[PDB]
């Protein structure tokens, strides 16, 4: 049994987090934003992670160069990242440092500088990130998945929005983006490790008081999409390697089918022909795919948004003459979810789950990074107790009732990278999604 | 001359990006009236005389034919039958 998540307030509503370990030395302290590229129209689309890269360029007291050594000093080390709905910066450091970190987490929030020769700087490096990003071929997939997935609508753009926007991104409306968005009731200060609750609240109270509230406050994680079911090609013969994903439409971090769609990932899972124990596996996709060679991996997974999510397959080939049977028999297994599991599937995979879902939580940044996930989206860090709960409550029944409402004959949203002639054309892919037999 | 899926004998191929959306999102018939009116027109119209030319003119030979024809079998052809013969 882990220690308790202690949860505290200030008044103007930003909430502090915190879990100790008194076993570790060091501490990840951060701010988690409710708040993202999603928030963007299409004219500002970059500029969230526009922000992320001036945070660091200096502010009304540190220039960049103080602001390198303090952190330096310190000894630890900072970082960010931005997604479509959520934005993270924090400090990892010693258990000691932290009110240093908490300091200068807090300047670079609220005192960036964001100096017009800065912002001419980044335009140059950030229009360089377009052009490089196109060899993580799992990224290049997934962000056409969801430009596809969520066609026109704002799931459906880019982190780094489009080249003429880097262009065109001002001083101004960088500013106009954190002082509307970044306001106290969409921020969690989050504590893990060798840190005190007390100590991180006087903290809070010391650096983030003077944090804007919004006008409107909304609970966290509060959000209509409309999935087109639809397919992008990007076929290279000169790549090596195949990468297809393939999505429906899954369910929202507050969906009573969360955990149902979680237990179905589950039964069909990962693969790596690379990790010794893949052959193994007892499911039923894998020993079709290590028995053939029809794939070096594939991953199931099952993304969650405030208001939707994609649940589905990314695989990756070389077998470029056998791509039609690793994609029919990858959706022949989907097909069972809706006909065939029983308690045997169901059991199997809730027991592998039940650990999965304590074992990611590791170091300190783990830990940090659930709390600051579950706080801003779910509105509360949920117990181990509560999910074992939830996750003993599926039964095989839900999931043959989910996967035939979500699964059964629905259009898919398909990505398909590198040398793929031998994926077959929209309709025959989504003819998979049923039996003719059932 | 042709392979088969994975080899098809395409040269290789890199730079095409293609898209496209599911049958249950398109609507099938979207645009039906203009296609069946004006793509039809200009379709047909610049194949007209492909067709117009050859047709009006092996029937213009045919008319003429039988028409001649049935003049020699009266009797007011009968001395350009009996030449004909």
Partial sequence: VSPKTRTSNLKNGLTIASESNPLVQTATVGVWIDAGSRNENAYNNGTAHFFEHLA???????????????????????????????????????????PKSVEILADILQHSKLAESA???????????????????????????????????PLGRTILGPRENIQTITNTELRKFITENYTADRMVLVGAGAVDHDALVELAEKYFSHLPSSQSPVPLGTPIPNFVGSEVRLRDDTMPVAHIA???????????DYYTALVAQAIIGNYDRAVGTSRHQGSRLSNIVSENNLANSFQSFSTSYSDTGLWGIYLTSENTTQIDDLVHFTLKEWN???????????????????????LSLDGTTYVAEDIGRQLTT????????????????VTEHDVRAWAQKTL??????????????????????????????? | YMGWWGHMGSPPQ????????????????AGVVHAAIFNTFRRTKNQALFVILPVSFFYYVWTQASEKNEWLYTKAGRHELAKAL
């Fill in chain 2, 14 to 29: 890199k730079g095409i990006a293609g898209y496209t959306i599911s049958p249950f999102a398109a609507r099938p018939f």
């Fill in chain 1, 56 to 98: 660091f360029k200096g502010t009304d007291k540190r220039s960049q160069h103080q602001l390198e050594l303090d952190i330096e000093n310190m000894g630890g080390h900072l970082n960010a990242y931005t997604s479509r709905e959520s934005t993270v910066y924090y400090a990892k450091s010693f258990k000691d440092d932290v």
């Fill in chain 1, 408 to 438: 059964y004959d629905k259009d898919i949203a398909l990505v398909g990278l590198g040398p793929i002639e031998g994926l077959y054309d929209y309709n025959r892919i989504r003819n998979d999604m049923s039996m003719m037999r059932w």
């Fill in chain 1, 336 to 358: 069972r979810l809706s006909t065939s599991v029983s308690n045997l599937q169901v059991e199997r995979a809730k027991s592998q789950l039940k650990a999965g879902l304590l």
């Fill in chain 1, 378 to 393: 779910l509105g509360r860090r949920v117990t181990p107790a509560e999910v074992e709960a939830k996750l003993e409550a």
């Fill in chain 1, 246 to 256: 393939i999505a429906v439409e899954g369910v929202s971090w507050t969906s009573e």
């Fill in chain 1, 119 to 153: 912002i001419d700087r980044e335009r140059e490096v950030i229009t360089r990130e377009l052009e490089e990003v196109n060899k993580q071929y799992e990224e290049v997939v997934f962000d056409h998945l969801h430009a596809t997935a969520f066609m026109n609508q």
